[PDB]
Design a protein around this ligand. Structure first.
Ligand SMILES: O[n+]1ccccc1S
Ligand SMILES: [Zn+2]
Length: 257
């Protein structure tokens, strides 16, 4: 099926997932001199006080931290969004070296990694129905750069040794995703898609301007995970990012002047 290698990577995905070449694919390059401030954006509201994380899972593509989305416990509202979106999971994408790894770029700059907090629109009842809608998902994207350690990421780093290979999972309760945010909620927004197969075109992207800083030792640990399963040839889980896609007839809006 699909991956990030020469033989099954992003340039192959269109064959099983033809929407790969669609009109609202992600990620994109954010050209900061083309994005216009939109003063009608409502303030962004990140409400993660009652977040209930369940489990962390190496899916052979990246790792996912999964949440209880049965009720309005961790939600994203405001900004470009109408209604209420419930947090279902977060995941990351990263590089083999610090000069690549993010999916979105900013003025062609690649960051060392990119975190996605994925939410679905409660008006559609469940995630599977939300991904049949053009406004079904909102993904909060956050860039990582290498500098000082991010304390709130360390509980993730230290569990990685227990989920080295594809198919492994671990309990991951009581994790507070507020610790992954930067200071500022300044953002860019545009309509796009999931950046992983099935590439569905259902996402309102909200990409924070301010990166978070993680230490070299934190990112090094992400690069010790494996794409392969237990006892198979080791293929380090690195460069699990899709490159920028054509912007087509889309507008990127800035929340800030
Ligand atoms: O990378 N990723 C995996 C699953 C669904 C959403 C996202 S952002
Ligand atoms: Zn993602």
């Amino acid at each position: 099926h699909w991956g990030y290698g020469k033989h099954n990577g992003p340039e192959h995905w269109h064959k099983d997932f033809p929407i790969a070449k669609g009109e609202r694919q992600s990620p994109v390059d954010i050209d900061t001199h083309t994005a216009k401030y939109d003063p009608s954006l409502k303030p962004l509201s990140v409400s993660y006080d009652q977040a209930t994380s369940l489990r962390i899972l190496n899916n052979g593509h990246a790792f996912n931290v999964e949440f209880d989305d049965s009720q309005d416990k961790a939600v994203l509202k405001g900004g470009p969004l109408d209604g209420t979106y419930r947090l279902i999971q977060f995941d990351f994408h990263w590089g083999s070296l610090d000069g690549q790894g993010s999916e979105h770029t900013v003025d062609k700059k690649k960051y060392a990694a990119e975190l996605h907090l994925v939410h679905w629109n409660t008006k559609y009842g469940d995630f599977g129905k939300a991904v049949q809608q053009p406004d079904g998902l909102a993904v909060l994207g956050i860039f990582l750069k290498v500098g000082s350690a991010k304390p709130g990421l360390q509980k993730v780093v230290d569990v990685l040794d227990s989920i080295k290979t594809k198919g492994k999972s671990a309990d991951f309760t009581n994790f507070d995703p507020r610790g992954l945010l930067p200071e500022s909620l300044d953002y860019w927004t545009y309509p796009g898609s999931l950046t992983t197969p099935p590439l569905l075109e259902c996402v309102t992207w909200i990409v924070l301007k301010e990166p978070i800083s993680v230490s070299s030792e934190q990112v090094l640990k992400f690069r010790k995970l494996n794409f392969n399963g237990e006892g198979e040839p080791e293929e380090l889980m690195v460069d699990n990012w899709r490159p920028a896609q054509p912007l087509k007839n889309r507008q990127i809006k800035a929340s800030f002047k």
